[PDB]
Amino acid sequence: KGEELFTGVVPILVELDGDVNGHKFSVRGEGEGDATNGKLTLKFICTTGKLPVPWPTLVTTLVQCFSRYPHDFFKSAMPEGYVQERTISFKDDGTYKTRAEVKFEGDTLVNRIELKGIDFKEDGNILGHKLEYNFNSHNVYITADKQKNGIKANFKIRHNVEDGSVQLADHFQQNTPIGDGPVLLPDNHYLSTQSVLSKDPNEKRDHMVLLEFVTAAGI
Ligand SMILES: [Cl-]
Ligand SMILES: [Cl-]
Ligand SMILES: [Cl-]
Ligand code: NA
């Protein structure tokens, strides 16, 4: 039933409230997703001024229901949706804790996020804005989390640093349905995401334009 909500192009709205080392900020994003081709197109702005962290560190936080149709937990949870929570551990640096609700509100798929970052170095790669404006593709293994009627995933993200090094970000993820309704649990499978970051030449606010392709593969 939920998968039928994704037969065409679906409008997306994203809202994030963040606090990293006491630096508070908010983000709004808008665009669309197409599960037929696994394509996401979104623009995000910081609505509070300068973004105090690099845009690439927010990519994974800022809708896996759009993975290209190859049983899908993320789609079957809709329209009631799912909670997505992560801890992201930046090597030699701080950690993010995120909680989000992803659900339909009318025709729009809405991702509403709270993010708290702690224990960051003010001069490190994150708060010091030392990361390149790109995002390395990753193949993520999605597994059933039977004890919570949802899924889990653990994976590394490597952010390119402006000195040629990499900043590792260990991701720990758990998703659980919001509704009491039935949901499909997937076979363990991989999602390949490949991302292109760009700028809107007419946007004066701190912002990110994002194009992503998400494809699924079995075992
Ligand atoms: Cl604004
Ligand atoms: Cl800043
Ligand atoms: Cl950035
Ligand atoms: Na700032």
Numbering used by the authors: 3 to 64, 68 to 75, 81 to 229
Q: What is written in the article reporting this PDB entry?
A:
Efficient and selective incorporation of TMSiPhe was verified by both mass spectrometry and crystallography. Moreover, the electron density of TMSiPhe was clearly observed in the crystal structure of a TMSiPhe-containing green fluorescence protein (GFP), an easily crystallized protein. Crystallization of GFP-Y182TMSiPhe takes ~1 week at 16 °C, thus confirming the stability of TMSiPhe after incorporation into a particular protein.
